[PDB]
Each structure stands twice: as structure tokens, then as C-alpha cells.
Amino acid sequence: SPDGVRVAASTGIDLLLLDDFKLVINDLTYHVRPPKRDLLSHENAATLNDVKTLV
């Protein structure tokens, strides 16, 4: 993840590609910046995220 947190071995790619993320090879930290493609109002994204769990 953009900070010390590392992603799992199960997170779906799109769930990852949502934002930047450092990819580490054997001895280097390649710093990926994927193209911003969320395309949804964050608040609206939130109020939907609220729904999904609430269901």
C-alpha cells in the first residue's frame, strides 16, 4: 500500500488499482502510480459502500 501496510495474497486487482501502490522486487521498491479511474463521487461511493455492507 502507499504506506508500510502490505496487501494480501487475495485482494482483487481492481480493489488494488484504485490508488497508488509500491511494488517491491527482490531488492528494489518500484513505485507504481496506476491511472486514476475511480470515476465515482467519493461521498456517493461512500453512501453506496454504506449500502453494500448494510445489506
Added chain:
Amino acid sequence: LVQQLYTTLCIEQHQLNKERELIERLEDLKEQLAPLEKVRIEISRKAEKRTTL
């Protein structure tokens, strides 16, 4: 929430826009057809005359 989500995303408009696209695309399919429609309806009429003969 979903209703607030509904109105806040102009979905009703998008719904129309969805269909409005389809009906338009169908018109295109009809448009390509009109030229080649008349040519077969002869070859139908022609191959019909030779058959009713």
C-alpha cells in the same frame, strides 16, 4: 440511502439514456437495410414470377 443515491446520480436520466442509445442503434440497423432491401425484393419478385410460372 439508495433513493438518495438514486436522485443524486441522475440515474433516471441515465436509464432513459440507456434505452435511447439502444433504439438509436436499432435505427442504424434499419438504415443499413433499406438500400439492400429493395434489391432482394426484386430478386424475390423475380424468383417468384419464375416459380409461379
